[PDB]
Design a binder for this molecule. Structure first.
Ligand code: UQ
Ligand code: NDP
Ligand code: ZN
Lengths: 86, 96, 125, 342, 208, 460, 115
């Protein structure tokens, strides 16, 4: 229930990652200034698919696919994870 | 130059000797440990240094074709003796 | 006539190899690196397949080096990477492939040893 | 743990197990199995022998090069024991005799020798001692052999407090004196049994189980000062056991009752042999005595061993006692005997 | 050039080349290649399906009469899609000549047995089956010849280890010879011997 | 550097270079070549515990693992912490991170300090050598800040000298005037100069403005002082002014960070907290020392009766202070992942097996997790590398060095904290050659390195 | 098509038929092997061992591989029937002198480095 880290795996030039890329290019910084003590690790995937990882207390974590999402979709799912839902 | 160890085991020329805690010593009970008594390092240290009147000397180990490959030794360093890389014999130039 | 099998080649059941030395082994497929002590390149032409290193221990009686794995000395030669990959796949071994390393072409100029205004001029010959 | 004694290898012939074991009485029945099991995994085995070296030859192939070392010893000489236990981390005592010789009696072989072994091993710094006693050892036992066993186990415990004592019961095997002893009684035509063997209960145990139990006790850190009881999985009335032995050997069974004093007289008569006696009065008493039940002591199952029943291993011992006509008979033919279990 | 160098014979080279052309002309259905080595040995590379015809021709032809099978063995080259190379050495006493016939197979493709042509083949094929695992169809009695009973694997394959997988000893508990995984007190020491400098320019391969 | 390990009959005989045009290309440094000697002494071979007298005594794996597991089940959260040393591999790092996460602990730290304000470890390009080692051959101006590339990264300095000799590269240094084996311009040693180049009030700012392929390299050793964050911010401001005045030259990646510790980049990729400050602020009761021998935290910084566990391969600073010793494998004794200062992930291979009873480090952590009741999912090396791919997918691409650049976001996040610089000259930890030979646990145990130190301190 | 030629069987059905014939022959032979070699095992043990060997190669889906396996099994049966094998050869199927090796991670971690 207690979020500890966020991991975003986005591919460098795959089309399906484009929206995710856009998000990092536009609205990552604001998020970082909203949660200045929260690890948001941005890493690169191989040719498979985008992914978002959310880790919680005591080692529990789950992942949500960000394939073909736009920037609005990734913002929506991210603020869904940061809030006490889903 | 064979010396003894604290347990009484003879020390080889390579310096091998079992420690007190080592169990392998049991292999020498009722038998003996084979040690060669002629330490080559002391024997080659016993040989006198040859004095020659040239900057370069040649060594083949003695006996011609029954020795080692023939090598040439430089004797320019005054504060050192030239040593054969095969035989261990030492050569120098007359000094003082 | 022919039967037109549509399976993947798999001969592990016929090679006599024990199961442990099939599933737990990792083979490496690579072009050996040139020995840095020499300039010759004739030993960097073929592909090699070799097995992962296992335990070696000292023999109690003479202090010799003792092993328990039978594949410690097995090295295979191949003309191409694809051939080695096919052999490893049909023998059931999981493999790691390393791409060939080729020295890049270099621009050599003996005249540059005596440049009028560059740093490449040599202070000794 | 003394780097040279760190285990290495895969546990095979050329491996290093980290065990340096001195096995007294290694040229006997249990000794060959114990030495073979130690040499299988690459242990350094020290064999003290008093017999002719020709009688130790069968132990030579049991170890890799240098892993089995033979040395002379005297049971009445402390310096021999010192010499053969100076370097071992495990000492196993399998010394025993079923009869008394002119030079060694039961008190010599079951009390004095085990006590000397335990004391010298404790002084030498040996950390593990395995001592073999009998399941029926009793200070008030009619048999001389059993009483000395009990006294010797007490003295061994006194000398080496952290010793592991193992008490088996009537080990059977290819070279045993249990199944062979009853099979060889066909030469007299009939089998004399005290009270027809209907008031004796036996719980025989397989030899390989005992050897594996000794090995596991060596490798068990919890078995330091423990006392174990190695017994088989089934209990048999003596009559039924002997009937089964004769059925597996396909020999005619002719049991007849002999009074105790007459059997004692026969044992007296056979004791006079200067060679190995065919039977002795003490042996007769032991055969007719029921096996004890000691549920408070740990057993083979506490060492990870499932006890092998006699029904799966009798043929490998008793096939030698068959005639040519019955030599090829399979093991599942001879209708296993009845057990008085619970 | 004279004393230390082996002399070459050109008459035999010409004759062997002519006979290779002859055999290739007569059997275009199976002959893939013909070669004459520079020490005057003639080889013919054929499709596997022509093992029986070609050999029969060489055995019974009036101009060939290769009536003796000197040797039959296999060579294992793992880098090839067809792993195994089958080699027949034939001798003609009438014309005092020798010929070599080569074909190929893999692990799962049978080769027709040539026992009907040469009796001597009977054991040789068995050996090839034992050491390499190549199956021969219509063999009168095909089974292991060299290895121990129940031996697993084919030891002459390149990927088979030199010391094998199992070793034998006598066990006193079971009173019999038993087999266990190999353990060596001294591991065999692999030597890396090849020089990094090329020895024979005449055999240099194109740099691909 | 890519190397070839020569071994005979189970013994490491020597170390030779292996050609990699992008990294070292034919050479190795003297420490890399002659430090193999150290591995043969001061080695941990058996598990150790504390006896009744407070002395370290050999024990079995079961006993030590049981003691550690009981101590770990006793506590939870901030009471558990770990410190990763300079030679740790990625597999063991991720295993320890998962194990401490199961206890709900996030105090996973490294000895090497990296600034955490702003972007921190969130963006990889913030802590990488983005130009790569090969890219030095294309630059025309390189600025060196608070670093001694000769001893921190000898092959990187060799590449700089190659560029200086063949491409007429221009080199300027801010820091102490060290000898770099090539002529360079010395701007000074005060950090104020950085601001002078960031404000445009320096001639070298003009020089960088007309540089079409400029590079700025900041050493990790300069980030170890209290004002490392301000230094990083100033260097980021300089890179910003370069990118703004000169425009965007495509993909050149002016910003660069030069690391000196082999384990740092993988630990940052996995989410380890750089520095040891979190341990200082919340002193734990159970501390894990994963090959940590820098002496950054002693028992004075920790409460009394604190349980300290050391896992490593050498007896050094960290072992005598530990309650339990877990002997691990050296880099020659395992197949393990290490990430470059470039960001390139590479793997070692087993040459010899670990001595005595020592084991693979990730295997030790997994066995401990199973003993303690929180069993980790992975059982083989391939499964641990699958977990590594789960946490950071660049750790399984074994020669890739290309990555995205997020300099704009990191720079924007770096200008909201305005801490001030210190009036202390930038002094590299290694000023001369004598401070080069002994830096880590293996080289400190080497007799050859001791001979080299004795030879350089006195000729004779 | 992949253009491959058969050994004996055209597809998996004929291969399974040959497997069943070989299994029948081995099952019939087991009691004779127990009698002739004077084995201390039971007939049930021998038939279970026979069943175990067949199950090991159950996964194979290629008819040529199955054909070769059947050929090898027939060779082994011929060796057994003619008493070319000895008692040691028959008992090698049972691995009676090999100490058991645990498959758990902890047991392997304790003993050594091998995976
Ligand atoms: C350790 O194994 C054992 C043996 O070793 C193989 C034995 O011999 C053995 C018995 C000891 C004897 C040697 C048995 C053999 C004696 C027979 C040959 C009996 C022959 C004596 C008779 C006089 C036969 C003639 C009959 C008359 C009426 C005439 C026992 C009990 C034994 O246990
Ligand atoms: N077999 C059984 O039924 C079970 C055995 N017992 C105990 O198990 C132990 C071993 O049994 P087991 O193998 O059948 O006995 P064995 O008769 O087969 O051999 C006993 C060993 O002790 C040695 N030994 C005997 N007397 C002396 C002596 N005076 N001096 C030196 N060595 C001597 C023998 O050596 P040498 O050949 O030179 O005479 C021999 O090696 C014994 O202690 C026995 O009491 C436990 C329950 C019953
Ligand atoms: Zn000489």
């Amino acid at each position: 229930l207690g979020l500890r880290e966020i991991r975003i795996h986005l591919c460098q030039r795959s089309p399906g990652s484009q929206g995710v890329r856009d998000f990092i290019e536009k609205r990552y910084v604001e998020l970082k200034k909203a949660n200045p003590d929260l690890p948001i690790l941005i890493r690169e995937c191989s040719d498979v698919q985008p992914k978002l990882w959310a880790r919680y207390a005591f080692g529990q974590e789950k992942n949500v696919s960000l394939n073909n999402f736009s920037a609005d979709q990734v913002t929506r799912t991210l603020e869904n994870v940061l809030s006490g839902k889903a | 130059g064979v010396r003894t160890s604290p347990t009484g085991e003879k020390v080889t020329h390579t310096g091998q000797a079992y420690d007190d805690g080592d169990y392998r010593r049991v292999r020498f009970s009722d038998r003996q440990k084979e040690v060669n008594e002629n330490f080559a390092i002391d024997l080659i240290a016993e040989q006198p240094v040859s004095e020659v009147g040239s900057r370069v000397i040649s060594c083949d180990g003695g006996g011609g074709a029954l020795g080692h490959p023939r090598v040439y030794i430089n004797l320019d360093k005054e504060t050192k003796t030239g040593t054969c890389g095969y035989c261990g014999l030492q050569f120098r130039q007359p000094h003082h | 006539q022919l039967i037109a099998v549509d399976e993947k080649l798999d001969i592990t059941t016929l090679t006599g190899v024990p199961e442990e030395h099939i599933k737990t082994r990792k083979v490496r497929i690579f072009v050996p690196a040139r020995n840095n002590m020499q300039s010759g390149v004739n030993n960097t032409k073929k592909w090699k397949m070799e097995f992962d290193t296992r335990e070696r221990w000292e023999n109690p009686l003479m202090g010799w080096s003792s092993t328990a794995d039978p594949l410690s000395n097995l090295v295979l030669t191949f003309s191409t990477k694809e051939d080695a990959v096919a052999f490893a796949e049909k023998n059931g071994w999981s493999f790691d492939v390393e791409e060939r390393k080729v020295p890049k072409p270099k621009s050599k100029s003996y005249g540059a040893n005596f440049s009028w205004n560059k740093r490449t001029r040599v202070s000794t010959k | 743990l003394h780097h040279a004694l760190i285990p290495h290898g895969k546990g095979g012939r050329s491996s290093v197990s980290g065990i340096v074991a001195t096995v007294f009485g290694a040229t006997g029945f249990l000794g060959r199995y114990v030495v073979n099991h130690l040499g299988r995994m690459g242990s350094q085995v020290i064999v003290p022998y008093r017999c002719e070296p020709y009688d130790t030859m069968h132990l030579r192939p049991m170890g890799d090069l240098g892993q089995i070392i033979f040395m002379e010893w005297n049971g009445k000489d402390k310096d021999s024991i010192r010499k053969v236990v100076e370097h071992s981390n495990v000492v196993i005592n399998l010394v025993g005799r079923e009869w008394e010789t002119k030079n060694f009696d039961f008190e010599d072989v079951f009390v004095k020798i085990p006590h000397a072994i335990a004391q010298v091993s404790k002084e030498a710094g040996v950390e593990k001692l395995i001592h073999i006693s009998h399941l029926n050892a009793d200070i008030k036992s009619p048999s001389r052999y059993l009483r000395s066993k009990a006294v010797g186990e007490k003295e061994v415990r006194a000398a080496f407090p952290e010793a592991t004592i193992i008490k088996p019961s009537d080990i059977f095997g290819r070279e045993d004196r249990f199944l062979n002893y009853f099979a060889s009684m066909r030469w007299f035509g009939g089998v004399p049994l005290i009270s027809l063997g209907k008031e004796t209960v036996k719980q025989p145990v397989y030899i390989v189980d005992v050897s594996k139990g000794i090995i596991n006790a060596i490798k068990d850190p919890d078995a330091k000062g423990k006392t174990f009881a190695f017994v088989g999985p089934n209990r048999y009335l003596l009559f039924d056991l002997v009937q089964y032995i004769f059925a597996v050997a396909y020999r005619p069974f002719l049991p007849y009752p002999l009074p105790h004093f007459a059997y004692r007289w026969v044992g007296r008569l056979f004791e006079v042999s200067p060679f190995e006696p065919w039977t002795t009065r003490d042996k007769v008493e032991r055969v007719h005595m029921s096996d004890m039940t000691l549920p408070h002591l740990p057993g083979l199952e506490d060492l990870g061993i499932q006890a092998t029943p006699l029904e799966l291993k009798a043929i490998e011992v008793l096939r030698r006692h068959r005639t040519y006509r019955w030599l090829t008979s399979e093991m599942e033919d001879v209708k296993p005997a009845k057990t008085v279990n619970i | 050039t004279r004393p230390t160098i082996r002399p070459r014979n050109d008459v035999v080279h010409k004759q062997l080349s002519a006979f290779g052309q002859y055999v290739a002309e007569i059997l275009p259905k199976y002959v893939q290649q013909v070669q004459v080595s520079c020490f005057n040995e003639l080889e013919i590379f054929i499709h596997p399906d022509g093992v029986i015809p070609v050999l029969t021709f060489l055995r019974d032809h009036t101009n060939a009469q290769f009536k003796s099978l000197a040797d039959l063995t296999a060579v294992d080259v793992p880098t090839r899609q067809n792993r195994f190379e089958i080699v027949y050495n034939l001798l003609s006493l009438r014309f005092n000549s020798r010929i070599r016939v080569k074909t190929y197979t893999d692990e799962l493709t049978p080769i027709e047995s040539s026992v009907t042509v040469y009796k001597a083949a009977n054991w040789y094929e068995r050996e090839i089956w034992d050491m390499f695992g190549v199956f021969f169809a219509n063999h009168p009695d095909l089974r292991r010849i060299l290895t121990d009973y129940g031996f697993e694997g084919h030891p002459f394959r390149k990927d088979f280890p030199l010391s094998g997988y199992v070793e034998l000893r006598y066990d006193d508990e079971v009173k019999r010879v038993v087999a266990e995984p190999v353990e060596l007190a001294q591991e065999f020491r692999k030597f890396d011997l090849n020089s990094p400098w090329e020895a024979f320019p005449a055999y240099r391969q194109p740099p691909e | 550097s890519n190397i070839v390990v020569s071994t005979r009959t189970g013994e490491v005989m020597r170390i030779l270079p292996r050609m990699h045009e992008d990294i070292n290309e034919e050479w190795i440094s003297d420490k890399t070549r002659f430090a193999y000697d150290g591995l043969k002494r001061q080695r941990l071979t058996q598990p150790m515990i504390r006896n009744e007298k407070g002395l370290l005594t050999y024990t079995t794996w079961e006993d030590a693992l049981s003691r550690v597991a009981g101590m770990l089940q006793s506590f939870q959260g901030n009471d558990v912490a770990a410190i990763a040393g300079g030679l740790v591999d990625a597999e063991a790092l991720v295993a320890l991170k998962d194990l401490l996460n199961r206890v709900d602990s996030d105090s996973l730290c490294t000895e090497e300090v990296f600034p955490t304000a702003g972007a921190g470890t969130d963006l990889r390009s913030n802590y990488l050598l983005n130009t790569t080692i090969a890219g030095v051959e294309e630059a025309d101006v390189i600025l060196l800040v608070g670093t001694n590339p000769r001893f921190e990264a000898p092959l990187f300095n060799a590449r700089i000298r190659k560029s200086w000799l063949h491409n007429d590269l221009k080199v300027a240094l801010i820091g102490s005037p060290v000898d770099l084996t090539y002529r360079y311009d010395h701007l000074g040693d005060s950090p104020k100069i950085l601001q002078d180049i960031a404000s445009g009030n320096h001639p070298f700012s003009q020089i960088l403005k007309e540089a079409k392929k400029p590079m700025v390299v900041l050493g990790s050793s300069a980030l170890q002082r209290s004002d490392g964050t301000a230094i990083l911010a100033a260097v980021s401001n300089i890179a910003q002014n370069i990118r703004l005045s000169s425009g965007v030259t495509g993909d050149w990646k002016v910003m660069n960070i030069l690391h000196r510790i082999a384990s740092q980049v993988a630990a940052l990729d996995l989410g380890y907290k750089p520095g040891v400050e979190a341990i200082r602020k919340n002193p734990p009761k159970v501390l894990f020392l994963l090959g940590a021998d820098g002496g950054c935290i002693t028992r004075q910084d920790l409460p009394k009766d604190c349980f300290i566990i050391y896992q490593g391969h050498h007896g050094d600073v960290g072992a005598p202070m530990a309650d339990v010793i877990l002997p691990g494998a050296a880099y020659t004794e395992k197949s393990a992942t290490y990430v470059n200062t470039e960001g390139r992930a590479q793997q070692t291979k087993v040459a010899v097996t670990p001595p005595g009873l020592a084991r693979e480090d990730w295997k030790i952590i997994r066995a401990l997790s199973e003993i303690a009741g929180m069993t980790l999912p992975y059982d083989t090396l391939d499964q641990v590398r699958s977990r590594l791919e789960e946490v950071s997918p660049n750790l399984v691409r074994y020669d890739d060095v290309e990555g995205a650049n997020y300099f704009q976001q990191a720079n924007e996040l770096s200008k909201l904290v305005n801490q001030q610089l210190l009036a202390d000259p930038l002094v590299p930890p290694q000023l001369t050659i004598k401070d080069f030979y002994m830096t880590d646990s293996i080289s400190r145990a080497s007799q050859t390195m001791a001979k080299c130190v004795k030879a350089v301190t006195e000729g004779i | 098509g992949t253009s491959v030629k058969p050994i004996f069987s055209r597809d998996m059905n004929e291969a399974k038929r040959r497997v069943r014939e070989l299994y029948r022959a081995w099952y019939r032979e087991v009691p004779n092997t127990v009698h002739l070699f004077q084995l201390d095992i039971s007939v049930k043990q021998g038939r279970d061992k026979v069943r175990e060997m067949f199950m090991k190669n159950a996964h194979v889906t290629d008819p040529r591989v199955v054909d070769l396996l059947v050929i090898k099994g027939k060779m082994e049966l011929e060796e057994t029937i003619n008493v070319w094998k000895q008692r040691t050869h028959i008992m090698r199927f049972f691995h009676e002198t090999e100490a058991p090796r645990p498959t758990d991670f902890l047991s392997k971690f304790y003993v050594g480095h091998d995976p």
